[PDB]
A paper describes a structure:
In particular, a consensus sequence present across multiple regions (i.e., Motifs A, B, C and D) that creates a dNTP-binding site (N-site) for [name]/[name]-1 RT is significantly conserved. Here, we report the acquisition of 3TC/ETV resistance using [name]-1 with three [name]-associated amino acid substitutions (F115Y/Y116F/[name]) in the RT N-site.
We determined a total of four ternary complex structures for [name]-1 RT3MB, including RT3MB:DNA:3TC-TP, RT3MB:DNA:[name], RT3MB:DNA:ETV-TP, and RT3MB:DNA:dGTP, to a resolution of 2.51 Å, 2.56 Å, 2.32 Å and 2.30 Å, respectively. In addition, we designed a DNA aptamer with three base substitutions for accommodation of 3TC-TP/[name]. The asymmetric unit contained two [name]-1 RT3MB heterodimers [p66 subunit (chains A and C) and p51 subunit (chains B and D)] in complex with DNA (chains E and F) and NRTI/dNTP. We also observed a closed conformation identical to previously reported conformation of [name]-1 RT:DNA:dNTP/NRTI ternary complexes. The α-phosphate of the d-isomers lies closer to the 3′-hydroxyl of the primer DNA, whereas that of 3TC-TP occupies the position farther from the primer 3′-hydroxyl, and is instead closer to main-chain Ala114-Phe115 residues.
Numbering used by the authors:
A (entry chain A): 1 to 553
B (entry chain B): 5 to 213, 231 to 427
The structure:
DNA sequence: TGCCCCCCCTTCGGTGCTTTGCACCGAAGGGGGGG
């Protein structure tokens, strides 16, 4: 049926008119699919015949529903969508089963022909004009317009969800201890009533939906576990993902690897330890989706590791609001982190991973802090609170980081957990110059227009060096000059530069970088005992710096 | 009443900013608050055909246990028409910063007695989120002058002055400044006699519909140079770099006769004696750094900018300026929250006190340059916010080339 | 040959800097998943 809910007023964008796009050819199996849908949507009043005074059109097609023996009608409203007003979408996220409480009685219902039970603004219907082909050659076609929400229109999902929300609200208020998870036309209904009273409330919910035109076919009325919901399986005490099948291939195209990583990312919500760094490395610098990419040795290993993890059966548990949330993080290498969120040990609510490189130069402590921030946000979304953290970093390491890093940084309540590899600072610059250490005055200049430069140093022990550099930059020659001083110095060194840029990077104490040259500087910094790094202004005649700047020019 | 016609600035559209996640206790409060406002007609339930949105969250003061709804209308206020162009702005009184004590009162509720132009209401939409996205968001828009909107003090202008004019006659030497939803009221009365005419002011207001500031101890911290008996090459290098930067701010500061103390390729720890002409140069530079800079005046047509630096051990330096190197105010914020541990809390508190000082002194908040990663700030700042206003800010990572402000 | 949402990984183009490349950021392209 068609809901008697008031329609939602909708506009085209200012200046714009309607679509005018001739129809294309379809199979006979799909023409008879739609004529059966379309003379029958007309009898129930979902569409109406029109003709030549309405100048608009938009092409139409059908795909097979995932239930087989049923077809989904779709119109290619790409043109109308562009000239239709913007909407504020009210679907703000996706419910997750780790946010659910244990319930004594559970039911899953789905509304039938959801979109077609919601009417469309009277004044907007004429822009939904289309035509049914019937073998193209035999007849020009029959023109209709939508009286209800069409599948493929930009505004249909939001107008349905908002309509469903208004219809549900009387029932929610009248029944505050029945949880209704509402995603599109899919309703999860849990309660702590014995199944008798529960099914009374269920049939009363369905009858309330029916008065407002929303059927709930028995076909999609789940009454017993395991419930199929949002891609998962809900058992009474636990939940699982529906089975994940990864591609297996002799030869891999870029698109195959793209699909592989996406599935692994989906699996990572419950399968701990998933890694995709080396498989995704294969997608860089590629230029086509059909390009055959051979797997590197490292990608084969990573895929094999994931395949071992996935052959194991896993489950999540549900949320107990009387117990604390606990998040534990482990380091995996190459900027990869994996985490589990639980309340009782060895009983995961869910898992996840963090593996983004923010910045050209960073360190493990920064990335641990980012992983904490992602977990904190995800916990607010799912449970409305942040968890207590268990982290593989020691209090002294963190304390040394937030006193010598100049940016404000923080991490909540956390308990140190000894799960190597531990997160650590890989070097620390001295706060003061070092007695007995050699002093290097470093400098490098480059020619903006020529690409050619030089890096070099002068030394309080009389040492000097200049290396010529080609196809370089100003900032590179300054980094290179610091590279030389670290290369030719002993275990303890004092370095004076005039590049704020180079000071900025190194003083942040990075341990990884997208720059090979910065990576070289980092490996040298880690092998040293003590390093004091000092800045001076250039071209003000200051001893050491002036002499080296002479030598580089 | 009659609405006042309101416009966005030419060629600008309304705000389109996504709601961010909220805790359980903040969502419940917003649901409690907004259902009451809907019942009183102050807001209306809307749907997705309104394409605008503004984030909403909630704050609770340490002293005031009740939750306060806070709509982040920064985007909308930027796009709203000027009201100084239409002559309905609020003049700032110079005397407020002179007063012994200033108390801040939240009078945003008075706005809810005046309706908003029906054609402007759609720009005020906001969306309450759902825990675990159990439901779609719930959308409202205002029917009255919104709290946090810069047009509300301007439209309510004529009315607030008439509510306040008996108090203003009765008490000539107390000065009252409206800024957004806040009344900043200052006087010279005793530390606790001042508080009682606060309470009389509030009853007169409660008739129709924070903590005590103390400006005469908002001391400036100048640039100061180290004092030692002995100086290493590194000390002189750092001191020459510190004054070479400061010469962009001050006039006639010189390094020529400390620089050549370092002629030659010297070790960083070698102790160089001080010439008489280097003590000449230093003791004098101490004096230019002593007293403030000549030629620096506030311009109300230009923006205020604020820079902050973490210095450690709980302390935070800041500078407020409009043109670079012409500081209207230099300062040092110190915490005493207890444990010394939380950088984000200290910086959030520092921003509120610095912005409070600009309101008292100049009448508007500065645009902050914050020494913090964007996503570290956004993970935590609403936890510590206590003001009904929100300043504009941006995120910088400037390493300290020199420790200029210590 | 459709629509809306969330997630991750990669690429690209805009912005500001007392710059001449560099680092940051948001959008857009692919993938996963949901209805
Ligand atoms: N590929 C898809 C799947 C779903 N939907 C939207 C329109 C649907 O009406 C609604 C609900 O999805 P369903 O699978 O439940 O389809 P229907 O409710 O329309 O029909 P049925 O009775 O088979 O459930 O979500 C869509 O636009 N495109
Ligand atoms: O923190 C920046 C972040 O906040 C948003 C809103 O969530 O923008 C707000 O803050 C900006 C900085 O002051 C303002 O310019 C803007 O008007 C205000 O809405 C996001 O847009 C932005 O990513
Ligand atoms: Mg359905």
């Amino acid at each position: 049926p068609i809901s008697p809910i008031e329609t939602v007023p909708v506009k085209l964008k200012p200046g714009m008119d309607g679509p005018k796009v001739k129809q294309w050819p379809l199979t006979e199996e799909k023409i008879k699919a739609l004529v059966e849908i379309c003379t029958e949507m007309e009898k129930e009043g979902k569409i109406s015949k029109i003709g030549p005074e309405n100048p608009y059109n938009t092409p139409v097609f059908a795909i097979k529903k995932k239930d087989s023996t049923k077809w989904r009608k779709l119109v290619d409203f790409r043109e109308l969508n562009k000239r239709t007003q913007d909407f504020w979408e009210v679907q703000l996220g996706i419910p997750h089963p780790a946010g659910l409480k244990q319930k004594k009685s559970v039911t899953v219902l789905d509304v039938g022909d959801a979109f077609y039970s919601v009417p469309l603004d009277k004044d907007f219907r004429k822009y939904t004009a289309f035509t049914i082909p019937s073998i193209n050659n035999e007849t020009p076609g029959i023109r209709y317009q939508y009286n209800v929400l069409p599948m493929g229109w930009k505004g249909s999902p939001a107008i349905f969800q908002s309509s469903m929300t208004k219809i549900l609200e009387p029932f929610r208020k009248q029944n505050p201890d029945i949880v209704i998870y509402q995603y599109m036309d899919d309703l999860y209904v849990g309660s702590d009533l014995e199944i008798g009273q529960h099914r009374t409330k269920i049939e009363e919910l369905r009858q309330h939906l029916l008065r407002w035109g929303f059927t709930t076919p028995d076909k999609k009325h789940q009454k017993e576990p395991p419930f199929l919901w949002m891609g998962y399986e809900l058992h009474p005490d636990k939940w699982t993902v529906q089975p994940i099948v990864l591609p297996e291939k002799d030869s891999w195209t870029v698109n195959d690897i793209q699909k592989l990583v996406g599935k692994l990312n989906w699996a990572s919500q419950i399968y701990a330890g998933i890694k995709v760094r080396q498989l995704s490395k294969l997608l860089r610098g590629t230029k086509a989706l059909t390009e055959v990419v051979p797997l590197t040795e490292e990608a084969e290993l990573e895929l094999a590791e994931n395949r071992e993890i996935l052959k194991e059966p896993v489950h999540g548990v549900y949320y107990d609001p009387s117990k604390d949330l606990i998040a534990e993080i482990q380091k995996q290498g190459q900027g990869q982190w994996t985490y589990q969120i639980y309340q009782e040990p060895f009983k995961n609510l869910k898992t996840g991973k963090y593996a983004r490189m923010k910045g050209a130069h960073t360190n493990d402590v920064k990335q641990l802090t980012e992983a904490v921030q992602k977990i904190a946000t995800e916990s607010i979304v799912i449970w409305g609170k942040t968890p207590k953290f268990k982290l593989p970093i020691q209090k002294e390491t963190w304390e040394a980081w937030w006193t010598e890093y100049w940016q404000a940084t923080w991490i909540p309540e956390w308990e140190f957990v000894n799960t190597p590899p531990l997160v650590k600072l890989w070097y620390q610059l001295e706060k003061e110059p070092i007695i007995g250490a050699e002093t290097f005055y470093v400098d490098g200049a480059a020619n903006r227009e020529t690409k050619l430069g030089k890096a070099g140093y002068v030394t309080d022990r009389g040492r000097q060096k200049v290396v010529p550099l080609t196809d370089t930059t100003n900032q590179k020659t300054e980094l290179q000059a610091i590279h030389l001083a670290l290369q030719d110095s002993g275990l303890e060194v004092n370095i004076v530069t005039d590049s704020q840029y180079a000071l900025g990077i190194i003083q942040a104490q990075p341990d990884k970088s997208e720059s090979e040259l910065v990576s070289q500087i980092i490996e040298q910094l880690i092998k040293k005992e003590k390093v004091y790094l000092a800045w001076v202004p250039a071209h003000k005649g200051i001893g050491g710096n002036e002499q080296v700047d002479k030598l580089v020019s | 009443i009659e609405t006042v016609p309101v416009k966005l600035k030419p060629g600008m559209d309304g705000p389109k900013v996504k709601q961010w996640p909220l805790t359980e206790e903040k969502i419940k409060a917003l649901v409690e608050i907004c259902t009451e406002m809907e019942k009183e007609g102050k807001i209306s339930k809307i749907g997705p055909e309104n394409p605008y949105n503004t984030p909403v969250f909630a704050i609770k003061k340490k002293d005031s246990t009740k939750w306060r709804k806070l709509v982040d209308f920064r985007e909308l206020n930027k796009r709203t028409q000027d009201f100084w162009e239409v002559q309905l702005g609020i003049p700032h009184p110079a005397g407020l910063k002179q007063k012994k004590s200033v108390t801040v009162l939240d009078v945003g509720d008075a706005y809810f007695s005046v309706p908003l132009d029906k054609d402007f209401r759609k720009y005020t939409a906001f969306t309450i989120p759902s825990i675990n996205n159990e439901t779609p968001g719930i959308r409202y828009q205002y029917n009255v002058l919104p709290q946090g909107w810069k047009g509300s003090p301007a439209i309510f202008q004529s009315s607030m002055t008439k509510i306040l004019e008996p108090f203003r006659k009765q008490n000539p030497d107390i000065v009252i400044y409206q800024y957004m939803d806040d009344l900043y009221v200052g006087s010279d009365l005793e530390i606790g006699q001042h508080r009682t005419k606060i309470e009389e002011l509030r009853q007169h207001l409660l008739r129709w519909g924070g903590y005590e500031l103390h400006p005469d101890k908002w001391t400036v911290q100048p640039i100061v140079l180290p004092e030692k008996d002995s100086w290493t090459v590194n000390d002189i290098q750092k001191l020459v770099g510190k004054l070479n930067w400061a010469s962009q701010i001050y006039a006639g500061i010189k390094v020529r006769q400390l620089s050549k103390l370092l002629r030659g390729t010297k070790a960083l720890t070698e102790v160089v004696p001080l010439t008489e002409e280097a003590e000449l140069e230093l003791a004098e530079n101490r004096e230019i750094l002593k007293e403030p800079v000549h030629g620096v005046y506030y311009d109300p047509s230009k923006d205020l900018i604020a820079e902050i630096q973490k210095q450690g051990q709980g302390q935070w330096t800041y500078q407020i300026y409009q043109e670079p190197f012409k500081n209207l105010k230099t300062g040092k914020y110190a915490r005493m929250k207890g444990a010394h541990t939380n950088d984000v809390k200290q910086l959030t508190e520092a921003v509120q006190k610095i912005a409070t000082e600009s309101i008292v002194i100049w009448g508007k908040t500065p645009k902050f340059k914050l020494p913090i990663q964007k996503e570290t700030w956004e993970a935590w700042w609403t936890e510590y916010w206590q003001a009904t206003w929100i300043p504009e800010w941006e995120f910088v990572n400037t390493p300290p080339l020199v420790k200029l402000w210590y």
